[PDB]
Scaffold this active site. Structure first.
Site, PDB file in Angstrom:
ATOM      1  N   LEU A   4       1.070  -0.143  -2.952  1.00  0.00           N
ATOM      2  CA  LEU A   4       1.098  -0.623  -4.401  1.00  0.00           C
ATOM      3  C   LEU A   4       1.260   0.814  -5.055  1.00  0.00           C
ATOM      4  O   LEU A   4       1.992   0.868  -6.257  1.00  0.00           O
ATOM      5  CB  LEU A   4      -0.155  -1.142  -4.970  1.00  0.00           C
ATOM      6  CG  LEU A   4      -0.316  -2.525  -4.344  1.00  0.00           C
ATOM      7  CD1 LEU A   4      -1.520  -2.590  -3.474  1.00  0.00           C
ATOM      8  CD2 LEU A   4      -0.215  -3.571  -5.217  1.00  0.00           C
TER       9      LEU A   4
ATOM     10  N   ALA B  85      -2.378  10.343  -6.937  1.00  0.00           N
ATOM     11  CA  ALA B  85      -3.041  11.539  -6.868  1.00  0.00           C
ATOM     12  C   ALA B  85      -4.296  11.124  -6.031  1.00  0.00           C
ATOM     13  O   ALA B  85      -4.758  12.128  -5.086  1.00  0.00           O
ATOM     14  CB  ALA B  85      -3.432  12.021  -8.332  1.00  0.00           C
ATOM     15  N   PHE B  86      -4.952   9.914  -6.373  1.00  0.00           N
ATOM     16  CA  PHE B  86      -6.146   9.578  -5.548  1.00  0.00           C
ATOM     17  C   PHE B  86      -5.754   9.345  -3.797  1.00  0.00           C
ATOM     18  O   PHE B  86      -6.536   9.838  -3.261  1.00  0.00           O
ATOM     19  CB  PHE B  86      -6.637   8.246  -6.181  1.00  0.00           C
ATOM     20  N   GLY B  87      -4.562   8.822  -3.879  1.00  0.00           N
ATOM     21  CA  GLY B  87      -4.302   8.684  -2.166  1.00  0.00           C
ATOM     22  C   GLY B  87      -3.080   7.585  -2.225  1.00  0.00           C
ATOM     23  O   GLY B  87      -2.733   7.091  -3.141  1.00  0.00           O
TER      24      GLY B  87
ATOM     25  N   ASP C 113     -14.347   8.244 -17.242  1.00  0.00           N
ATOM     26  CA  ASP C 113     -12.983   8.290 -17.168  1.00  0.00           C
ATOM     27  C   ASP C 113     -12.105   6.956 -17.460  1.00  0.00           C
ATOM     28  O   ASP C 113     -11.652   6.358 -16.679  1.00  0.00           O
ATOM     29  CB  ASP C 113     -12.479   8.663 -15.656  1.00  0.00           C
ATOM     30  CG  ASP C 113     -11.300   9.064 -15.227  1.00  0.00           C
ATOM     31  OD1 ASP C 113     -10.691   9.510 -16.161  1.00  0.00           O
ATOM     32  OD2 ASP C 113     -10.628   9.162 -14.135  1.00  0.00           O
TER      33      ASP C 113
HETATM   34  C1  LIG Z   1      -1.354   0.404  -7.955  1.00  0.00           C
HETATM   35  O1  LIG Z   1      -1.500  -1.130  -8.190  1.00  0.00           O
HETATM   36  C2  LIG Z   1      -2.421  -1.556  -7.853  1.00  0.00           C
HETATM   37  C3  LIG Z   1      -3.627  -1.291  -7.541  1.00  0.00           C
HETATM   38  C4  LIG Z   1      -4.891  -2.120  -7.393  1.00  0.00           C
HETATM   39  C5  LIG Z   1      -6.007  -1.782  -7.154  1.00  0.00           C
HETATM   40  O2  LIG Z   1      -6.295  -0.508  -7.175  1.00  0.00           O
HETATM   41  C6  LIG Z   1      -7.635  -0.014  -7.073  1.00  0.00           C
HETATM   42  C7  LIG Z   1      -8.300   0.171  -8.194  1.00  0.00           C
HETATM   43  C8  LIG Z   1      -9.688   0.753  -8.318  1.00  0.00           C
HETATM   44  C9  LIG Z   1     -10.240   1.269  -7.086  1.00  0.00           C
HETATM   45  N1  LIG Z   1     -11.544   1.510  -7.154  1.00  0.00           N
HETATM   46  C10 LIG Z   1     -12.414   2.154  -6.100  1.00  0.00           C
HETATM   47  O3  LIG Z   1     -12.157   2.320  -4.954  1.00  0.00           O
HETATM   48  C11 LIG Z   1     -13.769   2.278  -6.783  1.00  0.00           C
HETATM   49  C12 LIG Z   1     -13.882   1.782  -8.279  1.00  0.00           C
HETATM   50  O4  LIG Z   1     -12.795   1.377  -8.909  1.00  0.00           O
HETATM   51  N2  LIG Z   1     -15.386   1.804  -8.521  1.00  0.00           N
HETATM   52  C13 LIG Z   1     -15.723   1.378  -9.936  1.00  0.00           C
HETATM   53  C14 LIG Z   1     -16.932   1.904 -10.150  1.00  0.00           C
HETATM   54  C15 LIG Z   1     -17.225   1.867 -11.645  1.00  0.00           C
HETATM   55  C16 LIG Z   1     -16.716   1.034 -12.303  1.00  0.00           C
HETATM   56  F1  LIG Z   1     -17.242   0.665 -13.643  1.00  0.00           F
HETATM   57  C17 LIG Z   1     -15.679   0.230 -12.062  1.00  0.00           C
HETATM   58  C18 LIG Z   1     -15.203   0.603 -10.705  1.00  0.00           C
HETATM   59  C19 LIG Z   1     -14.368   3.602  -6.448  1.00  0.00           C
HETATM   60  C20 LIG Z   1     -14.754   2.458  -5.691  1.00  0.00           C
HETATM   61  C21 LIG Z   1      -9.382   1.197  -5.990  1.00  0.00           C
HETATM   62  C22 LIG Z   1      -8.135   0.512  -5.912  1.00  0.00           C
HETATM   63  F2  LIG Z   1      -7.210   0.764  -4.688  1.00  0.00           F
HETATM   64  C23 LIG Z   1      -6.907  -2.656  -7.221  1.00  0.00           C
HETATM   65  C24 LIG Z   1      -6.869  -4.145  -7.391  1.00  0.00           C
HETATM   66  N3  LIG Z   1      -5.364  -4.599  -7.452  1.00  0.00           N
HETATM   67  C25 LIG Z   1      -4.449  -3.417  -7.308  1.00  0.00           C
HETATM   68  C26 LIG Z   1      -3.342  -4.159  -7.749  1.00  0.00           C
HETATM   69  C27 LIG Z   1      -2.227  -2.957  -8.091  1.00  0.00           C
HETATM   70  O5  LIG Z   1      -1.104  -3.656  -8.367  1.00  0.00           O
HETATM   71  C28 LIG Z   1      -0.603  -4.866  -8.723  1.00  0.00           C
HETATM   72  C29 LIG Z   1       0.759  -5.019  -9.273  1.00  0.00           C
HETATM   73  C30 LIG Z   1       1.988  -4.603  -8.595  1.00  0.00           C
HETATM   74  N4  LIG Z   1       3.106  -4.736  -9.395  1.00  0.00           N
HETATM   75  C31 LIG Z   1       3.421  -3.727 -10.184  1.00  0.00           C
HETATM   76  C32 LIG Z   1       4.632  -3.904 -10.835  1.00  0.00           C
HETATM   77  O6  LIG Z   1       5.824  -3.828  -9.938  1.00  0.00           O
HETATM   78  C33 LIG Z   1       5.751  -5.025  -9.062  1.00  0.00           C
HETATM   79  C34 LIG Z   1       4.360  -4.817  -8.233  1.00  0.00           C
END
Ligand SMILES: COc1cc2c(Oc3ccc(NC(=O)C4(C(=O)Nc5ccc(F)cc5)CC4)cc3F)ccnc2cc1OCCCN1CCOCC1
Ligand SMILES: COc1cc2c(Oc3ccc(NC(=O)C4(C(=O)Nc5ccc(F)cc5)CC4)cc3F)ccnc2cc1OCCCN1CCOCC1
Lengths: 277, 279
Positions: free
Chosen positions: B19, B23-25, B134
């Site tokens: 996806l 920068a995060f990875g 953030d």
């Molecule tokens: C880059 O595209 C996407 C990334 C996604 C995603 O990313 C993450 C989000 C947060 C974390 N958080 C974490 O790992 C953590 C976190 O978020 N903690 C946290 C802490 C406090 C808080 F309040 C909320 C969250 C650190 C644990 C980790 C992730 F991997 C999560 C869920 N669905 C995703 C769907 C994505 O595209 C779908 C659409 C794609 N289309 C785009 C258009 O072209 C076609 C394709």
């Protein structure tokens, strides 16, 4: 870590007394079995806290200055010992209590001048103290000051656009001005024994400090105008305008100080009062 | 669930896409071999031992943040020197990615829905003594139904010397510190309205000084937007933390108090979903 970790302390030093039963903890007075050099032993009972203390020793290990306490060794056996060069005069706050009077203006000038030499040395190494008080400044027989910590102070996400004003101020050059303010308070402390707003409890004073005007000495006649001017320039709420340690070194209050005789007299005087019985 | 450290994740999930290289990875799209429920896998190679220890605490924070408008944690694994984070798949994606794909900003009704759901999210976190620190469009994910899922990507956190010898500045710096997220929230609305955050022309180093020295920013062209919109931004953007309104207080504001439908967000997700099929 550099800390020697393979020797039980009994071989090197023997405990010979207690210097104070205190909030920081118990600190003993010890003599070296080989050379008999006097020193102070800070014994602490701890975890990750030990790792937190390890940086504190390394900070002091690099702070080699005449006006800073000298560290002789650190050992960790029988579940951490800190040896510090023995300062026979003791802390200035304990001395003021024993003599039941405040410091003289000549004695303050010597203390103020030597502390600015220490702070200028520390700030140049990007190290702040954050706990400047009479209790953290010890005295030698020769009349010199050795600055100390007596704790775990001495220090040294988010996206930029979406950050708040308080976050930029609190988080990130001009962060050294806190010690300068604390120094100005210590001068008033050594002059009038107790720090400003000492009637209040610790919770209320914090609110009292912010709104209030900068503190001044009670009796403006007794002290010089240069003393009052040095206090007024040092006690400035605005950090950007607050002068550094180097700027105050070139100030008449301490720029013309060449002798520590005034402090040397105080240590001998306090030493004599201890014997009274 | 607690992080599994002796089971290989490959048995549980199968990678089906990437996806974003970010920068995060690296972030992959994954499907469960048994149920196929779909998820997103955030894989990090922890450099040190304390790097891992910081991240595992972050996961445990998210494990307790069980709320409709916050991303759900599904699993966590650590094998072959890499750290896996399993999170419920959000098809809409981050809104900043949506704004780029659609090449336009969100409408005021769409912002109102996003603003109301985020105000519910922040109020839930602050009651648990958790700050985000953030808040941006990139941290706001979207579902098919038109709902918001808040995310971190970075790191948030759940929650010396004698006072007499203290200075004024330390008194300010050292339980009313939850107002920082409110500021980031007010800026995010402007970002979703104008695509780019305030002071985006300047370089990142300069922004820190510009934020403090300048007075709080306002929207560029108010003609499209309401006074209720302008007032909500203006009331949120207050420099003094003590005076800054809390999350519960901003919920009782007409800009978001009279919102009963998420249809505006549902339309946005359907439009973006269709645009992907183009070229
Ligand atoms: C880059 O595209 C996407 C990334 C996604 C995603 O990313 C993450 C989000 C947060 C974390 N958080 C974490 O790992 C953590 C976190 O978020 N903690 C946290 C802490 C406090 C808080 F309040 C909320 C969250 C650190 C644990 C980790 C992730 F991997 C999560 C869920 N669905 C995703 C769907 C994505 O595209 C779908 C659409 C794609 N289309 C785009 C258009 O072209 C076609 C394709
Ligand atoms: C309480 O009385 C005394 C305490 C002593 C002493 O205490 C310590 C000071 C600092 C540290 N700091 C540390 O272990 C550390 C530190 O201070 N680091 C540091 C950091 C920054 C900096 F700028 C300087 C130092 C933490 C490492 C450790 C100590 F053990 C050190 C040396 N001599 C002492 C003599 C004392 O009385 C002598 C007179 C007694 N008589 C008086 C008359 O009545 C009868 C009794």
């Amino acid at each position: 870590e550099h800390v020697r970790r393979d020797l039980d302390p009994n071989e090197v030093w023997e405990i010979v007394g207690e210097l104070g039963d205190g909030a920081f903890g118990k600190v003993y007075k010890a003599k070296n079995k080989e050379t008999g050099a006097l020193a102070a032993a800070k014994v602490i009972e701890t975890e990750e806290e030990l790792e937190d203390y390890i940086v504190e020793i390394e900070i002091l290990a690099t702070c080699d200055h005449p006006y800073i306490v000298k560290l002789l060794g650190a050992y960790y056996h029988d579940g951490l010992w800190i040896m510090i060069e023995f300062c026979p005069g003791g802390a200035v706050d304990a001395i003021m209590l024993e003599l039941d009077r405040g410091l003289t203006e000549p004695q303050i000038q010597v203390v103020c001048r030597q502390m600015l030499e220490a702070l200028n040395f520390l700030h140049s190494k990007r190290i702040i103290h954050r706990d400047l008080k009479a209790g953290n400044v010890l005295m030698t027989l020769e009349g010199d000051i050795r600055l100390a910590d007596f704790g775990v102070s001495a220090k040294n996400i988010g996206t930029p656009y979406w950050m708040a004003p308080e976050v930029v101020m609190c988080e990130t050059p001009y962060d050294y001005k806190a010690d300068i303010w604390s120094l100005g308070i210590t001068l008033i402390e050594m002059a009038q024994i107790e720090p400003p707003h000492h009637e209040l409890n610790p919770m209320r004073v914090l609110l009292k400090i912010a709104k209030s005007d900068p503190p001044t000495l009670l009796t403006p006649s007794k002290w010089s105008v240069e003393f009052r001017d040095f206090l007024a320039i040092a006690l400035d709420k605005n950090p950007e305008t607050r002068p550094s340690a180097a700027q105050l070194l070139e100030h008449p209050f301490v720029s013309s100080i060449t002798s520590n005789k005034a402090l040397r007299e105080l240590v001998a005087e306090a030493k004599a009062e201890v014997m009274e019985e």
